[PDB]
Amino acid sequence: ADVAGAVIDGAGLGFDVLKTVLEALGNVKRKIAVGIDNESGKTWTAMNTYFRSGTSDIVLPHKVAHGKALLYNGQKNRGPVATGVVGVIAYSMSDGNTLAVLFSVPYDYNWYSNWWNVRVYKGQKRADQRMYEELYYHRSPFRGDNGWHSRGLGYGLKSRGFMNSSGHAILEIHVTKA
């Protein structure tokens, strides 16, 4: 019929529009490269990385000795999903405390920005949703604003970090004795 033919043409147009929209959604790239230098005078032992958003394809390096650096990366989930890569990295230190690092590379830059944070926790604490919420909402995170930021960590330690503002994020932190 003429009605049926119009329906098929409309459905074909909708199919092409849907394919284009899904391809566009799936081509957004959000990834994070993390580099942390250990000058704290103690060895770091990896515990876990809690991903609020996104995932990683590699192993979190088990040991970071003093004078060495941590290399890690992650990215958003494969496919046409509108989420970024957000998470916290937790490392156990020889003193018995935990070094926690937040990163946040959002999908939607109309509402969100890049954020990062560094904090030392007393005792051995694995990264989870509660730790991420603390570091993102209550512990004064740093904006990924192409700037350098310094802050004392307590426990005779201090941090100095940098994060850019684009969706190809890179986070670089130096942990040194205060």
Residue 136 is assigned to a ligand binding site: yes
Check: CB of residue 53 under 8 Å from CB of residue 74: no
Q: Which is nearer to ligand FO4, 20 or 124 (CB)?
A: 20
- Tell me how far apart the alpha carbons of residues 76 and 61 are, in angstroms, rounded to a whole number: 20
Helix (H, G, I), strand (E, B) or coil at 130: helix
Which of 5, 67, 79, 123 contacts ligand FO4 by CB under 6 A?
Answer: 79
Half-sphere exposure of 63 (CA within 13 A, CB side): 6
Q: How many CB atoms lie within 10 A of CB 115?
A: 19
Q: Toward a copy of itself, which CB reaches closer, 19 or 154?
A: 19
Residue located via tokens 């770091």: 44
| 143 annotated to bind ligand | yes
Q: Which residues contact ligand FO4 (rule: CB under 6 A)?
A: 11, 14-15, 17-18, 20-22, 24, 28, 52-53, 55, 77-84, 86, 104, 106-109, 112, 165-168
Q: Which residues contact a copy of itself (rule: CB under 8 A)?
A: 1-6, 8-13, 15-17, 19-20, 46-51, 55-60, 62, 77-78, 126, 145-148, 162, 164-168, 170, 172
